[PDB]
Amino acid sequence: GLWDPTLPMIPSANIPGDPIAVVNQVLGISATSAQVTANMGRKFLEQLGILQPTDTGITNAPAGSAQGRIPRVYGRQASEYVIRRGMSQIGVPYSWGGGNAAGPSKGIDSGAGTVGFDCSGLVLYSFAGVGIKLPHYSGSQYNLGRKIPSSQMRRGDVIFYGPNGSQHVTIYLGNGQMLEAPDVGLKVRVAPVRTAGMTPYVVRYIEY
Template sequence: MIRRAGSQMGVPYSWGGGSLQGPSKGVDSGANTVGFDCSGLVRYAFAGVGVLIPRFSGDQYNAGRHVPPAEAKRGDLIFYGPGGGQHVTLYLGNGQMLEASGSAGKVTVSPVRKAGMTPFVTRIIEY
């Protein structure tokens, strides 16, 4: 799942973009760009291991078990904004996360940001 998401490094950010099969044209501001938004990238990653999760980050936040951030494991989802509705990333471990970043304009690895983070991360796959 992490390998599948990581294979998209550098793919453009496209609001509303991303399908189960890969990058796609987004909507509104992303309508002319083939790429991923945050929740589209995460959904694509999990689909690669046969796990279907909802399309929107606020729904993804409630799709698994909530875990305190201090107990986050590689593959957990980190959310931002009320109810996780503003942004979602894939935790890589060692303080790093993989994300389709609107500010970076692409799929990239970033340090985990604490500002705006929800009180819990979400574990979709238990191991």
Template sequence: MQATAQATQTTLDLGRQFLGGLGINLGGPAASAPSAATTGASRIPRANARQAVEYVIRRAGSQMGVPYSWGGGSLQGPSKGVDSGANTVGFDCSGLVRYAFAGVGVLIPRFSGDQYNAGRHVPPAEAKRGDLIFYGPGGGQHVTLYLGNGQMLEASGSAGKVTVSPVRKAGMTPFVTRIIEY
């Protein structure tokens, strides 16, 4: 429970910094709104949602070249993973996505299968920058961040690092997930 409270507080603080940079003050101390991070996407004013998505993409992109580490990644950046990633500081796919969204105050689940259900499902033909693309049953095998123009940003186990790749259709779930509406 302590880890959840700490993750929520960290995400709230990051979101307040981002929104403060846009001149938006949500008011009140962060500690008084522990559930705000879980609904952070709805707290981002729609007029600023596109800026939030671009910030999410920049935050994830700032990690280009960071090693892949299964189970790696925290709200603050790369971390040691688990099992095969135990000796590597880096990100796995869901850790990178969680890190990216935390930067705008949106706390999403840690595991890709849970991230798949964290937003609104959209047909892939309607995907926008910042939507999440998933692979495997229920999105449980892999998640990437859609960049547009057939490109995605991912922590790739096969490439061994955070990289930009062409969108792969094979194994893709029937929907992408939109976390921030714009």
């Protein structure tokens, strides 16, 4: 009962630190997920008309706090942008360990020769668009943001599975549907919410 039994009943891929997200071999540049995320965060704050010289572009609230950089009045817009980014990846192949703040990527282990997303890769890619920086491991994502009782999950909240949220992670879309990068041989998809192995809390990264 600990796990969603439709997926491998093991911890999801755990990709350390701040991986390289962009490589341009012609120009000779590269940048990490955090760099991409900061840059998008600044762009998003600029689009809201609220960019300040003290803004790095990283917009996460301190873990557990209901207050964070993006004003609540702009939270719905931020959430919808995150969801639009995720939804724009419908049909991208699943890859174990795949994905970074810039888009799908080669995975690790199993997924080393496959460009795509895994569960936490898709979530971090989606949220990076508004400056929300997330580690590439579902268990670590579960420790960030603010807990909301799962029975009270709201569109844009993030659903976790397995002990400590280690098995799988998805974005709730409302109306009993969720966006996910599910398993080998599948693609990023909308699917009905599953409650087997679901943690008792969802995570909210954007207040509104």
